[PDB]
């Protein structure tokens, strides 16, 4: 996506939780995923 790498699904949850979750590692993280960008 625009913010966010090709791993990712930005879901801000009905509790107040935007989990930036990677689909290649299946990791739910609140840490900046764009950090992984060098993956390309």
């Amino acid at each position: 996506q625009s913010f966010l790498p090709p791993g990712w699904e930005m879901r801000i949850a009905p509790n107040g939780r935007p989990f930036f979750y990677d689909h290649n590692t299946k990791t739910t993280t609140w840490e900046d995923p764009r950090l992984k960008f060098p993956v390309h």
Binding site: R11, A13, N15, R17, F19, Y21, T28, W30
Partner: peptide
Amino acid sequence: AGSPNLSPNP
């Protein structure tokens, strides 16, 4: 859905 809603519990 199959969207990431599973909050990591620390």
